[PDB]
Design a protein around this ligand. Sequence first.
Ligand SMILES: Nc1nc2c(ncn2[C@@H]2O[C@@H]3COP(=O)(O)O[C@H]4[C@@H](O)[C@H](n5cnc6c(=O)[nH]c(N)nc65)O[C@@H]4COP(=O)(O)O[C@H]3[C@H]2O)c(=O)[nH]1
Ligand SMILES: Nc1nc2c(ncn2[C@@H]2O[C@@H]3COP(=O)(O)O[C@H]4[C@@H](O)[C@H](n5cnc6c(=O)[nH]c(N)nc65)O[C@@H]4COP(=O)(O)O[C@H]3[C@H]2O)c(=O)[nH]1
Length: 85
Amino acid sequence: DNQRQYPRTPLKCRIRISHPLFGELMAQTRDLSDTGVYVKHPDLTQLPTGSVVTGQVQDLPIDAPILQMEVVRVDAEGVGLRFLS
Ligand SMILES: Nc1nc2c(ncn2[C@@H]2O[C@@H]3COP(=O)(O)O[C@H]4[C@@H](O)[C@H](n5cnc6c(=O)[nH]c(N)nc65)O[C@@H]4COP(=O)(O)O[C@H]3[C@H]2O)c(=O)[nH]1
Ligand SMILES: Nc1nc2c(ncn2[C@@H]2O[C@@H]3COP(=O)(O)O[C@H]4[C@@H](O)[C@H](n5cnc6c(=O)[nH]c(N)nc65)O[C@@H]4COP(=O)(O)O[C@H]3[C@H]2O)c(=O)[nH]1
């Protein structure tokens, strides 16, 4: 029954989410796998599915990677994102 290719573990960090038209905001992750991340913020919950956002974790010693992510789903609290190839 498990349809996840990779397991998810809790991870909470500050992440900047940006989109060319919708603008940017600072959110927090909730959980992570090798293929995707859930990002919690009320203002993300109306992103269309298929939106492509960039995310970059904040406040790391090193500059974090800037990741392209697809919005695969929204819920009451945020969005499920999949990292792009
Ligand atoms: N479309 C979509 N929705 C997603 C995805 N991941 C989470 N959700 C949504 O978020 C709810 C809560 O997920 P959860 O806390 O991981 O809590 C999950 C998790 O513990 C487990 N679960 C369900 N399906 C899977 C699965 O394929 N693999 C694993 N490992 N757990 C699953 O059952 C709980 C309840 O599942 P749901 O009733 O389905 O309720 C899910 C579903 O509505 C996803 O990749 N795609
Ligand atoms: N960390 C994280 N990543 C997320 C979340 N929601 C989506 N993703 C990412 O987006 C991918 C594709 O999600 P999907 O198209 O809904 O495709 C999902 C969905 O159809 C199903 N699925 C997995 N978990 C659940 C679940 O809890 N409930 C339901 N209903 N479906 C699930 O299995 C497919 C493949 O799941 P994955 O291989 O995990 O692949 C997931 C994962 O990399 C989330 O809450 N947290």
